[PDB]
Write a protein that binds this DNA or RNA. Structure first.
Ligand code: ZN
Ligand code: ZN
Lengths: 115, 115
DNA sequence: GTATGGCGCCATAC
DNA sequence: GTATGGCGCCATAC
């Protein structure tokens, strides 16, 4: 209940972290990994995963988009448009490209590239 | 293209009339019936129908709600909450209650009842 | 029971 | 081809 506020158009992201924290409060020690990672981009951070839809897309308060794009745009670049502006760092084990069963929504595992 | 502007949070209704006009430009003389009806509540008005979903609900720019509630709230009471505040007039042949195959979204075929 | 909202699937706009 | 968005179906909150 207060985890959402601490992790935090504003009312749409609020609905998005909400969608997220519900998935993370269920995973083991998962909320903890994320709270630390919002603090330091340079400090090492563990992967925080959510399940992957067949589509790839995640729908949040009736808007539908890719998960790492969503949570980056909540926590880093609010002007972020599409996944092309994103690229995964070398740190991350479950990037969106990976097509693996889970997908990392830790916002600092990706850098923004304006092509 | 200009029909939408003439029939006309504002940018969500704009997306809704858009969803609508596309269905009406396909029906025969249907756009015409609606243009007249936005003018006069007291003047007699023909039914303007759209298809009915099994659910009943209509999704518009990612929000989902009942059709007569949507188009009433666009064109009459913007503070309208649920379908309980609505009741169909005696004029209408395809009210939402009717569960018929089409459904009348002419905003003036319904009156608002605060219970 | 009713209300509400996401996902897989599909249809349509570039 | 990629992007985008609605509907039927289902799962969950009252
Ligand atoms: Zn990662
Ligand atoms: Zn009618």
């Amino acid at each position: 209940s207060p985890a959402v506020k601490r992790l935090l158009e504003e009312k749409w992201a609020e609905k998005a972290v909400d969608a997220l924290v519900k998935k993370l409060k269920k995973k083991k020690g998962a909320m903890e990994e994320l709270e630390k990672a919002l603090s330091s981009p340079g400090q090492p951070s563990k992967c925080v995963t959510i399940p992957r839809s067949l589509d790839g897309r995640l729908q949040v308060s009736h808007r539908k988009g890719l998960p790492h794009v969503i949570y980056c745009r909540v926590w880093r670049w609010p002007d972020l448009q599409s996944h092309h502006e994103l690229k995964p760092l070398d740190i991350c084990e479950f990037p969106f490209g990976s097509k693996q069963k889970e997908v990392c929504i830790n916002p600092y595992h990706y850098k923004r590239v304006e092509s």
